[PDB]
């Protein structure tokens, strides 16, 4: 089997992407944030504290003939931006782009933090990291991809995120029309539960490539590219007027600036992030100061190849016995 679903930016900055997912019988369609940096499929629901729901579409398990409560099971998650959610657990039928998993753990939120409430466009998350990070207790549950794997034509999914445009998540096949040139594959460590890999270096604009190992994660659920302070300083040093602002929370630059591209290495291959992808717009409405899309990972504890990087590539998440990641230009 295979699946193919379009993913759509939630706003004009590509802050996140939403993908329609069918849950239950008859189908209830919710728009979920596919997150390769976490491993819980959780939804706003009929159980979510009423005051914490604001415009989201909710899953109502009592209206699904295929829903079953996983008795006694609970979940609770905290993300890198400090947001969180928690609740109880159902199993139900979940379909993405024509691909159906029966008995998928669907984690029903009883509580969500303010950032989730305040984002009316995101009805929940669909985790695509390794199931070892799943937060269900007492017994950890499998991700949608883990459950689908054995039925897939090939044990893979691909992320093809758009710049200011929709893109595609495919399951079970590689669309050879969706990229240019060849896909370069690179090793993955699952030791921390993430799609963790080592970039071979970087270049700024037309500069020479610096060969240096940068360990990080491929994370579709993080907006920006977070890299070591050395690398990030070297980038912004090439932008007139750029500076790190502690008050704003990162590097800012004059909105009038022309941003250089940023190249990262995948083995002997190279992915070029155009300068425009690094512009995240005014720091506040009407400001002539803009927020940078490449920021320091210092204090996160891990480097994160988030959407700014991933949307410059066609990315293969290969869930074979020995997992790998593939990157192609497009």
XYZ file of C-alpha atoms in Angstrom, residues 132-307:
176
model
C 10.580 4.951 21.622
C 9.638 8.629 22.268
C 5.889 7.960 22.532
C 4.523 9.195 25.881
C 1.609 6.781 26.457
C 1.673 5.112 29.871
C 1.746 2.407 31.098
C 2.425 0.904 27.653
C 4.042 2.971 24.896
C 2.180 3.087 21.585
C 3.373 2.980 17.976
C 3.398 5.857 15.519
C 1.205 5.893 12.437
C 4.298 5.130 10.312
C 5.411 2.258 12.570
C 1.917 0.720 12.346
C 1.706 1.217 8.569
C 5.219 -0.017 7.812
C 4.702 -3.690 7.110
C 1.834 -2.918 4.729
C 3.778 -0.298 2.761
C 5.265 -1.093 -0.634
C 8.570 0.257 0.735
C 9.207 1.127 4.418
C 9.591 4.856 3.816
C 7.869 8.186 3.953
C 8.916 11.406 2.233
C 8.562 15.059 3.124
C 8.388 17.581 0.298
C 7.602 20.886 2.007
C 6.853 23.975 -0.022
C 8.255 27.464 0.276
C 5.182 29.697 0.720
C 3.238 26.902 -0.969
C 1.713 23.466 -0.338
C 3.815 20.328 -0.492
C 3.404 16.589 -0.038
C 3.859 13.740 2.445
C 4.059 10.353 0.721
C 4.046 6.967 2.454
C 5.428 3.786 0.959
C 7.002 5.074 -2.252
C 9.496 7.589 -3.621
C 8.108 9.910 -6.283
C 11.002 10.112 -8.728
C 9.352 13.101 -10.448
C 9.462 15.231 -7.291
C 13.181 16.031 -7.195
C 16.095 16.926 -9.465
C 19.290 14.906 -9.716
C 19.877 12.066 -7.299
C 18.958 11.374 -3.686
C 21.976 11.175 -1.375
C 21.472 8.906 1.617
C 23.156 9.332 4.994
C 23.253 7.351 8.248
C 20.733 7.788 11.043
C 21.153 7.274 14.756
C 17.982 6.305 16.620
C 19.694 6.503 20.039
C 17.745 9.615 21.094
C 14.545 8.592 19.281
C 14.978 11.137 16.477
C 15.909 11.105 12.805
C 19.407 12.112 13.854
C 22.157 12.443 11.257
C 25.455 14.229 10.649
C 25.759 16.969 8.070
C 29.183 17.205 6.442
C 29.449 21.002 6.601
C 28.174 24.325 5.333
C 28.761 27.338 3.129
C 27.476 30.903 3.356
C 26.422 32.439 0.065
C 29.150 31.985 -2.573
C 31.720 31.151 0.098
C 33.850 28.023 0.126
C 32.330 24.972 1.792
C 33.577 24.336 5.338
C 33.937 20.613 5.975
C 32.797 19.999 9.550
C 30.525 17.423 11.187
C 27.208 18.832 12.441
C 25.007 16.330 14.244
C 21.318 17.232 14.211
C 17.753 16.095 13.707
C 15.424 16.279 10.702
C 12.378 17.887 12.320
C 9.350 18.885 10.267
C 7.678 20.190 13.443
C 10.260 22.931 14.025
C 9.966 26.088 11.931
C 13.574 27.292 11.816
C 17.096 25.991 11.271
C 19.027 25.828 14.576
C 22.786 25.295 14.287
C 25.899 25.846 16.415
C 26.637 29.446 17.388
C 29.867 29.443 15.354
C 28.013 28.550 12.143
C 25.178 30.960 12.780
C 27.520 33.867 13.561
C 29.414 33.202 10.320
C 26.124 33.400 8.399
C 24.787 36.638 9.910
C 28.188 38.336 9.717
C 27.520 38.454 5.962
C 24.284 40.427 6.381
C 24.600 44.187 6.732
C 22.975 45.394 9.942
C 22.299 41.925 11.346
C 22.704 41.364 15.058
C 21.680 39.009 17.820
C 18.981 40.552 20.003
C 18.403 39.099 23.455
C 15.187 41.126 23.748
C 13.740 39.742 20.515
C 15.159 36.256 21.063
C 17.610 35.791 18.224
C 19.207 37.243 15.135
C 17.394 40.123 13.474
C 18.273 42.087 10.356
C 16.971 45.050 8.356
C 13.989 43.905 6.324
C 15.555 45.629 3.285
C 18.607 43.342 3.346
C 19.475 40.859 0.637
C 20.124 37.573 2.438
C 22.800 35.161 1.227
C 21.946 31.530 0.665
C 23.014 28.848 3.118
C 24.355 25.485 1.950
C 24.458 22.337 4.064
C 26.259 19.109 3.270
C 24.726 15.658 2.948
C 27.672 13.372 2.355
C 29.374 14.727 -0.735
C 26.113 16.356 -1.855
C 24.897 19.871 -1.114
C 21.487 21.407 -0.370
C 21.172 25.145 -0.972
C 18.670 27.121 1.098
C 17.891 30.309 -0.846
C 18.278 33.579 1.040
C 14.552 34.319 0.799
C 13.771 31.183 2.845
C 15.740 32.693 5.745
C 13.472 35.777 5.979
C 10.776 35.367 8.652
C 9.420 38.846 8.332
C 8.927 41.763 10.699
C 9.645 41.051 14.362
C 6.310 42.737 15.105
C 3.650 44.219 12.845
C 4.966 47.276 11.019
C 8.597 46.908 12.081
C 11.471 47.390 9.639
C 13.454 44.810 11.618
C 13.034 41.211 10.470
C 13.576 37.887 12.238
C 16.144 35.429 10.920
C 15.374 31.876 9.884
C 18.762 30.527 10.977
C 19.284 30.749 14.729
C 21.660 29.363 17.344
C 20.946 25.966 18.881
C 23.009 26.850 21.957
C 20.905 25.961 24.945
C 18.585 23.611 23.035
C 21.026 20.738 23.418
C 20.635 19.565 19.823
C 20.929 21.020 16.333
C 17.640 21.053 14.442
C 17.181 20.916 10.696
C 13.681 22.328 10.776
C 11.386 23.491 8.014
